[PDB]
Amino acid sequence: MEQVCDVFDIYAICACCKVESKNEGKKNEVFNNYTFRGLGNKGVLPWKCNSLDMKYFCAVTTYVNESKYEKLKYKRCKYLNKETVKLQNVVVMGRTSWESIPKKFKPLSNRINVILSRTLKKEDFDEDVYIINKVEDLIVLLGKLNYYKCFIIGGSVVYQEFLEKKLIKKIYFTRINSTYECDVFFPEINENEYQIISVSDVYTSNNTTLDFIIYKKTNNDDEEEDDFVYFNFNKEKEEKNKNSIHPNDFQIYNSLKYKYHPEYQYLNIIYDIMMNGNKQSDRTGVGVLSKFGYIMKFDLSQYFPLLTTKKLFLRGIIEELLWFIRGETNGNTLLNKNVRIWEANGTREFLDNRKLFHREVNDLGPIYGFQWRHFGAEYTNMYDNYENKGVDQLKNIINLIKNDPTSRRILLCAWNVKDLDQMALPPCHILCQFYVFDGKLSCIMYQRSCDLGLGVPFNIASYSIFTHMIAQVCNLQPAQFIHVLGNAHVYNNHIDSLKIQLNRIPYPFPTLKLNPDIKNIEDFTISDFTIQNYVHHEKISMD
Amino acid sequence: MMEQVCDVFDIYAICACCKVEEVFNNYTFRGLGNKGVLPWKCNSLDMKYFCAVTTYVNESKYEKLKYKRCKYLNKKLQNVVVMGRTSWESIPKKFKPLSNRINVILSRTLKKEDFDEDVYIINKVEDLIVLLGKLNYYKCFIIGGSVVYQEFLEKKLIKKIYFTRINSTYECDVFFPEINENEYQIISVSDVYTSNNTTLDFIIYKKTDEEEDDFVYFNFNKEKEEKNKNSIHPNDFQIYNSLKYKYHPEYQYLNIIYDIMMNGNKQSDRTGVGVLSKFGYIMKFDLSQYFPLLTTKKLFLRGIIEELLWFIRGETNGNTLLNKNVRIWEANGTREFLDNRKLFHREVNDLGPIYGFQWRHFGAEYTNMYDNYENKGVDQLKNIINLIKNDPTSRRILLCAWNVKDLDQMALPPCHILCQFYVFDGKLSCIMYQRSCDLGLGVPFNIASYSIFTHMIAQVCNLQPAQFIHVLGNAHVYNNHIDSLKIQLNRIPYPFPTLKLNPDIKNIEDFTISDFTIQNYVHHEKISMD
Ligand SMILES: NC(=O)c1ccc[n+]([C@@H]2O[C@H](COP(=O)([O-])OP(=O)(O)OC[C@H]3O[C@@H](n4cnc5c(N)ncnc54)[C@H](OP(=O)(O)O)[C@@H]3O)[C@@H](O)[C@H]2O)c1
Ligand SMILES: Nc1nc(=O)c2c([nH]1)NCC(CNc1ccc(C(=O)N[C@@H](CCC(=O)O)C(=O)O)cc1)=N2
């Protein structure tokens, strides 16, 4: 049986930012969709203006397809039983919202402007600017008009008094990922009434990241299509797929239509290794599902790609980077700061199984740092002085970027074939290549071995931060970080956790902030790095 | 105004053509039959394609077609197949009549009484049309006989030709007619496949729901047309853009060219020519199905095979290649070139510690190209073969030419930085990372080289080759190549060739040039990238 919002095509469109608590978050803040609920402040927007949100609002509320109207006209008039009634959309708002708009571009261009109010009389306005007395009389006015879709463009009350009356088929919802002072807030959307079916790319505008999501009301030449089917004649269409994983499992992941959030590059790879991976044994003797050769790209000028579908920490991985940059190989330096990334690889037991019987505990051999600052020097022990020994690759790439930015030889390589056996383990992160165009730096990192569940989330972060570091000391803006995965594997003991993760919807990404005073690569310290607006799902223990 | 018959009754042709017992064109593939049977006897994948196409039906779409045909006449679902009598007689008895299809048979010498089978007999093309008028069916496929294909093409009764290119040569006595390019144009090209010891592909000649808004919304910030960079005209890629489906794996290469031309960044370069460049691509080629030698221009493999054998031997002496009339490394070994690299004490054509040396002796002190380096440095090639044999699930099977210490002593640094290998279920894949990529000239050869190398390693390790995966870093088109690449991007690829190795070679160091054969290379003409 047909419903009102379904017939008249009534949608809500809004934008919500984060709201400050006077109660400083003394415990770990808990995030959900309701985190983004701030609508207004003192009769205006909490962030004053956002030029990309404003472009999106206009674009959505004014777009019309005339060739799909008849079906809507036939739907509506037949619903009303009657036979008879430039195509434009209806925008419905409250009195305050209408007063909030500046007169210069009021009324709202190319739209049928309706205004809910009880002190407004039609006398003071016009015919094309409909005034309405109550919620009930909209449906009446929509029966007498030619319009494509009907958008409730807000007022806290208006949204409130439309959602509880179930008059909203979809909510077009912008997540503004920054905090402001707010006096009015969007209602709390009930997970049983609406659900997200799409998530956009992540964007930066007016000094904040944002994304656009779509809530959907829940249910509680032609013959160019055939040529397509012919080209698929050689597939294996079935019920059971390689690795015993079910339909139930990825319900929410598969229920989304559009998944353009860049976090899906990581999640889709996980999905693909789960659906199509090869069962293989491994060195650790745990078992993996693996595939070979993927690429991700992250636009560092729009966001910092810190995964939001679980909680990630960055002190440790920043310290590792600073340790690399110093050329250090001494695992004790990291352990004394309680960064234990390399602890297991520096034990007596581990070093002995590597046949490094004459190596001091936590002396990791000529690994990353040594290779970046001293490639080709003779490694002795972790306490020796190597000043001016070997090739200082880090310095060389920084000089190439500054003086010869179009070079195709700007590479930082860790995979020193001669020294491999002396390393506690060989590098997973083989090399970094750099590319500079128009004042912008991009970096490719080739990773030979990628633990999708535990390692890769951190690996993305390390090299994003490093790309910022290199860019800043060379007076460039960071553009793309490009992650190439060789042997890409999901450990079997991660499978259940990654199943939980794949059915979580990303939040818009945070931003990285470097102390702008730092201008040489060796001058960074742990307090020079700030992550802002990290909104994330709850922590997951992978193992 | 008024419809052609082929449109109203959806009359298509499906056929398969081999090469016939050198300049190549579409007419290269024209072998239809021999001694009343197929020139190749049998091809499983082609048969499967044939069955899939001629039996596939879309129930939802019929009522739209019923109206069309009923308006034109004023008025379980199956397709029709129409064949010549001789072709009917070549079908084995247990496959007559073709299952799940209405079978129609053209004949003058035989009549309904001469057939036991549920089939329509007609003695006139015109009668086929009358019959289609009376029947309920989805589409009508003319499945040939050469005599049948010819007359239907001449009468302009064919809306599309579904054409299989069987990329091998056989004895033939009957032939598909030469298609007129003025009347039919190719609109789609499939992936390339191997079946019954031949490659083949499938091409198509053509006669010359609420969510959809959400998609428009999420595209609200995409650019206009005119802002998308370079001086590139529509007319320049009209054939390239004419194609509906571009699934031939050569499009991985061609699409990258296209992308660099339309979206690339204008940059100066070490050479002074300047390029359009972009950063980070990936191509995948399935070596179990084809050898990915580009077909949209002519390439030779003798040189790059000799180069590869020279690498495997650990050589750094350019004279070895010049004596086999291979001049790939010539320019990088001249007095002048070595002087410009500050290598004043290097003998001419002594390329220094390049690829071969790093593969066999990484870390050894380089002296000159004549020295005996026995058991010095790390023999990486040997190690990766041992790892593949004895520890196939290792994630450390890498071969690296970027020896940071030695870079300055090389005539020039390597472009092919590394190879990583992967082993599953008896099958070997290879990723090669290329730091710098001359799309126009180098990339077609580099694809070939490493595909061959993957074959060689797979073989001496008793594996079958699987994927060559090519990763490009600085991917550039030289400006002096643009006009030649505009030409090539409008050529339609041909089914790829195959590569055969002497199967008696069991150690990587034992291959010689004659142990390599390229078969069935069909290609467009040579292009100077001038
Ligand atoms: N590679 C492929 O794709 C493919 C596809 C199909 C067939 N084939 C091969 O092609 C060969 C057979 O082809 P073909 O040209 O020799 O024979 P065909 O075209 O199958 O048959 C010719 C016969 O069909 C009947 N016919 C054709 N046009 C007619 C008309 N307008 N009116 C009445 N009858 C008509 C006549 O039969 P009567 O003599 O009884 O009058 C005529 O002799 C075989 O080798 C077969 O294997 C290859
Ligand atoms: N593309 C193409 N390939 C062909 O082999 C072919 C064609 N077109 N057009 C006409 C034709 C006529 N010759 C033949 C000979 C035998 C069968 C046959 O036995 N077909 C069965 C087997 C298919 C299967 O089991 O995969 C059929 O049901 O189609 C069909 C056509 N053969």
Ligand SMILES: O=c1ccn([C@H]2C[C@H](O)[C@@H](COP(=O)(O)O)O2)c(=O)[nH]1
């Ligand atoms: O920064 C890191 C370090 C390690 N690994 C993973 C990949 C493999 O699971 C394992 C390294 O061991 P091998 O692949 O070298 O055996 O750790 C990462 O993903 N990222």
Ligand SMILES: O=c1ccn([C@H]2C[C@H](O)[C@@H](COP(=O)(O)O)O2)c(=O)[nH]1
């Ligand atoms: O096998 C090769 C060797 C060279 N090049 C190209 C890429 C660059 O245009 C040039 C070397 O350039 P540099 O990056 O060294 O400047 O040669 C290839 O594409 N493939």
